[PDB]
Amino acid sequence: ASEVPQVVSLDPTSIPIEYNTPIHDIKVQVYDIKGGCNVEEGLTIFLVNNPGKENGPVKISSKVNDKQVSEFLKDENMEKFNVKLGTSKHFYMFNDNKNSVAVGYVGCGSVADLSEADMKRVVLSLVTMLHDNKLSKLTVVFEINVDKNLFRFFLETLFYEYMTDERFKSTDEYIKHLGVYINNADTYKEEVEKARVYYFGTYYASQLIAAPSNYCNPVSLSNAAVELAQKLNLEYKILGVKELEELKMGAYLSVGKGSMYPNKFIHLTYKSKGDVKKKIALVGKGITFDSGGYNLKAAPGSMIDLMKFDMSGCAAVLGCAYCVGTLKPENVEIHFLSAVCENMVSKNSYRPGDIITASNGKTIEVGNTDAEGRLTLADALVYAEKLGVDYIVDIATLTGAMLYSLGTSYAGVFGNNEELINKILQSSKTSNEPVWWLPIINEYRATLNSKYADINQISSSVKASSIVASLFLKEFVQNTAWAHIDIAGVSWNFKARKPKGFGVRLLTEFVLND
Amino acid sequence: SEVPQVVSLDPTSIPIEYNTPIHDIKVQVYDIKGGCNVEEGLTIFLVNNPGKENGPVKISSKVNDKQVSEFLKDENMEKFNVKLGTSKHFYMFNDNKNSVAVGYVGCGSVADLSEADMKRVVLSLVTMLHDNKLSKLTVVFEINVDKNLFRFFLETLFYEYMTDERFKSTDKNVNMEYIKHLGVYINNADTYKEEVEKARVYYFGTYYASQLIAAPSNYCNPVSLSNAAVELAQKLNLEYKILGVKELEELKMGAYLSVGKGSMYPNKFIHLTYKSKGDVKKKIALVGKGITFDSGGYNLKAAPGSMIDLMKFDMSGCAAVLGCAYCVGTLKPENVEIHFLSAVCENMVSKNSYRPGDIITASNGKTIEVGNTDAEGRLTLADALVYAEKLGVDYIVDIATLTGAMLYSLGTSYAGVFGNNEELINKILQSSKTSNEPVWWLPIINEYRATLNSKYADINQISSSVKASSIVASLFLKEFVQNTAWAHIDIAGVSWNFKARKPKGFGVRLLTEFVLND
Amino acid sequence: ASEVPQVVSLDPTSIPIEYNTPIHDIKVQVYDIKGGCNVEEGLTIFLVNNPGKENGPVKISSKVNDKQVSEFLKDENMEKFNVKLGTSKHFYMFNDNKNSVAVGYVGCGSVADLSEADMKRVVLSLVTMLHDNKLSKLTVVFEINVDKNLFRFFLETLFYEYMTDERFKSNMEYIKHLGVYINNADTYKEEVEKARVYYFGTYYASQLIAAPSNYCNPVSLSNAAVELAQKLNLEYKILGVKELEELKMGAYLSVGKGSMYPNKFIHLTYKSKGDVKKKIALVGKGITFDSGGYNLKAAPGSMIDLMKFDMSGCAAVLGCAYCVGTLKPENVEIHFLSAVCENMVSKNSYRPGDIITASNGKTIEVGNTDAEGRLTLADALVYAEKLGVDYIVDIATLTGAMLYSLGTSYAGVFGNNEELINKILQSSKTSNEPVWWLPIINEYRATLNSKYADINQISSSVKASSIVASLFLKEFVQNTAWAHIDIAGVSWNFKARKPKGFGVRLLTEFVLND
Ligand SMILES: [Zn+2]
Ligand SMILES: [Zn+2]
Ligand SMILES: [Zn+2]
């Protein structure tokens, strides 16, 4: 940890982090639906669908251990309501002990197998029932089929969407118990604490992303990474400017020349206690603010105000270290890397046209100072490869063109090894964080031929930027299976005006499945 | 106090002319009933024809000279008309056989002249003084004007006549001489005599504001401007205090300090005070926006129409306040205590600048999410308004070149006024009427307040959905006044005279009248 | 009826209009709150506040005539909920007779004086419940204070927002009963059928606006006006191209030159049965599609896809004819005028630079074909002044600058007569359609001095376009009190994606109170 420089004494010197969240105090109990449902304090919600009958009637199938409640929920009363996805209703009644109880349902539609996006919709409806109601307990009854992974996803999403970030509130009551009734409850029980770990990894990444760039700068972000490593007993090394110069990391150093915050390179290590059978490097893009540099983000739709989110890759990688440090997988050694800097406008900034030398000796002609993420990634990839790992996976908010290709719902994966790419797709399936494979088109490579330097940073002819940037990055991996995840489109949730913490669960499923 | 320089040729003060040639003009008001002596220089009749649009010129005064009277006969004048702003020059020999210049300016056919009408009349008169060498001008009012409008006539004649040559070097105007005497003939002269020296004080407050606004950003920076304010206070015997960065850190003025983080000039907060001898009945804070240059910061002013070359003028609010301090310090009103406040800084691009997305904390403890670094004026004004309210004052009035949207609502002639108290608003509209500086009341629409809701901070600096940005800025400002009558004058559209390529010094007379009226 | 031209046989030949709406089937009853509440049937909603306590607990005071619901409404239950403006909850339960009811509340925040905008939010939250409700009755309990006009505004807004427009389409049932409990119920009763009339005026204007330009064109619009006039027994005349040529309406006819639809000038008249003491012309801008013409709407932000709404003023004037023809004021004669045409790109369109002659003989130099609204209004105003009326009021979606001056909530009013402006502002207050007085600054008039014509259509220097447009219109009224209402910013509800029908209630209040 290093001292964070300040312009004025009011400049903050750390990122505030909440570790002990109210989600962590919630006691979760899972019961088997075969024993019937007890219905007492709090709110009890049934998840009901009607397969094949679009907006069909509600029917409650589980046994309920209360005669008054069973009478309320009989088919004759419930058929006046429907299962349209996301629809919900609240019921109030007195039970067999003459106590008042709150019951309800959320509609899960008429398709038997819910997609990740469907389930999020169900969760959002459920969370509007928790907001503005002081409840001590929620009980959820699954009258719908879900596999183990989708059940976990239900929990993670619930926790994440319910949790509210109030770190930056100044002048401006969570349940204590969650009951779940499900068929074959004993097989779903194992997902509960995994879900709690996954929730905090994602929420932790989200806290880092959402923290503005005066709070979250290269020095305070690397200090947060140190403090994480100390709580988790990971090994850690933060490389500063003198060390970076010695390693000849001139692509990464040039991007950070115009910042008042010194570059800091984050290297965290998890090692398994047993024989190591696989070595992995996870590389996240870490630009704490992206002004564009002398290629300033001034054009309509450039969104300079969103640019604190340009370290979302480093955040996903640190959220992954949290989950890995907590779950403790065997047989694996994982390095978590991020070349952290800030891209600013200064007398000291690198310029359009500058020629700079990366730590593998390749000279690069800078065509646009706003394509800085690929320069910092190029030195981090060289460093990752020198570690002698089996796989290198990077994750980055790299290109705006992602919005035009896959949009805000799916991230793109590119890579040089099909087996690795399949493992990432497999991890997408089991994490329920959607990614789609996109090609590295070798025909475009000639457009990176520089008249003067070994290579151009950008294409002056090809508009397919996310592909061009993957071609550039590929030049910095000589002999290792490598994949690149571009999360520029999926990282920020525009509708809810907050980060998704996207990638933490995807990467962690990758490591654990391996 | 010491102004930092990058090279030794960078200026270390704003040049300021105090004893201007207007101050050397001897002015005498004479009653028209005695008739006009016509003996030297230029004599101009202000003449109308009520009813008859572009009607003929007919002189109504007695003139105590046979020759000049002969020249001014109706038959001779009938070739000429009274269309607003039209003028003519005559040359003749009086009874003492000395050459004499005589003339008229047309004042139209509507016997009640607006502020804009009287401005056209003065402009034509000033064209008659330019490119001529004259020792004496006399003006004969053959029109009806109230006391305020007669004073406006003199203030405007003085301001428009005065030429600002501080930054000329090889191109100083060789042929520029000023009159030494001004005679005015008018009905019931004794009653207008009091307006002469008041006009002279109002002219200078206004010209002084103009000098600071016109001074480029390399002459007028936060250190040199706060230094000029100290000098002004010292000449007037006002109490004064300039708060520096260490004091502003202790006061926790985080919104104001974030704006100046990227500047080579330390933030300086100006606080001057005028206090009447005897009973203080009203305490007022006047707060002026004092951004000495506004580049936009990282939301740089790069879009077509953004006029970054005009942005030395973004301290026009602070100039108005300082010109007001001049008039107040000179005229010495009773029963008031006036605080003249400006949070002065410069909005620049640097490794040190604040960024879009940053969350900063104001001196009242409110956290603010920056959505655009070029909305910097309301961040500075938020901390200045907290400071003003902690002074225990009865009224807070701020004046500011805040939003370019003023050009689309009121344009270049009228300023907009917003506020939280209808009595205060009405006092401002009243002073608008007696100062002849036009203002229009605009609404603070509370339905837009929800668009300032921030997901992370207590409040957003800017709306992402509402385009009525002068209204949104006022709703933002209103959050920094808890329980005091407050009004806000947006002068972004009126401050610069685009036609004449100079400042208006808008606001000095409006604020003084407001103070003196109280 | 004129025949509607068609390019293909599938082109529509009329505007579909619903006259008998489900709102017209609602039986409304108003009871005094001091008597306590009958809650035995249907959905009951309490409007509740907590003055001084930001986000304070809900507390319901009314005595209710049901033991189950009474239990539900006890303080210990309701304090789980808060009063933040627009927040709502509602619960299904069984009443003392084991019939299904539902009960809830809508939060009215912590300030006793509700504004109109505040009241819209309350209504929207109530409407959200209604759009999921199939109980046959709604009871609204006012545990808050509102004046007569605000209560009528509550009803108008409830009816307007509840009603949904399904004319172009190929969960709920509309209620049949509405009960209101409010203090001084006897005085509020006279507001009910006035609200229902104002609601339909506003909805009918809305149906015209929302109808796309292939349904709603100069011929189909003026046909609709004739059918309206017939149903209300108003006098009517539609002026066609040959009559408009005889009348020398050169400015209006030039704007419509490029359209396939002939210009149609609408003139309806209501005349009171008694002595006529005031004569009024209401003139509405009626461009059924504004492409901009050769000055095409191609710049970012020009919103060409919204430009079916450029007949909003005409629609307001026609909604007002409905209300006036229904309510039948005494002592007045009202002329409802619109110069209807469509502004298109064609070999036949007028061009930037054309000099055109208005029906008062003034020659006009066209500087921009997208400032067509004021050309059509110039001839309409001349037409109106020849009728010999006491007051002319025009209403028009005239300048996009309105979004930069007053925004989307308040319209601007400009005029040549202080007393008429005062009556408009007073009607704004009583109709709850907000307007703000803006000046006609005479110093800008010189910017309309054309080198070649009598006058310019636009300024080439002044950016205050709403004022400049008003200066231009003012040249076409010689000696009559006139006011101009610019509703460009307030006519379309961008968040709800539908028209407001703005101006119907303001116009009616103006005519009813004069
Ligand atoms: Zn970037
Ligand atoms: Zn500014
Ligand atoms: Zn139009």
mmCIF file of C-alpha atoms and ligand atoms in Angstrom, chain C residues 285 287 290 297 307 310 343 370-373 397-398, ligand 3:
data_model
loop_
_atom_site.group_PDB
_atom_site.id
_atom_site.type_symbol
_atom_site.label_atom_id
_atom_site.label_comp_id
_atom_site.label_asym_id
_atom_site.label_seq_id
_atom_site.Cartn_x
_atom_site.Cartn_y
_atom_site.Cartn_z
ATOM 1 C CA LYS C 285 -51.794 24.952 -35.598
ATOM 2 C CA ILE C 287 -49.763 20.404 -39.503
ATOM 3 C CA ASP C 290 -44.059 18.083 -40.492
ATOM 4 C CA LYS C 297 -35.571 17.362 -40.167
ATOM 5 C CA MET C 307 -43.981 14.994 -36.206
ATOM 6 C CA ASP C 310 -47.602 18.916 -35.154
ATOM 7 C CA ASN C 343 -45.328 19.932 -44.951
ATOM 8 C CA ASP C 370 -39.358 24.030 -41.348
ATOM 9 C CA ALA C 371 -40.777 27.333 -39.786
ATOM 10 C CA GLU C 372 -44.045 26.605 -41.624
ATOM 11 C CA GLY C 373 -46.297 26.706 -38.517
ATOM 12 C CA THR C 397 -46.427 23.247 -31.275
ATOM 13 C CA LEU C 398 -44.361 26.155 -32.674
HETATM 14 ZN ZN ZN D 3 -43.798 22.516 -37.414
#
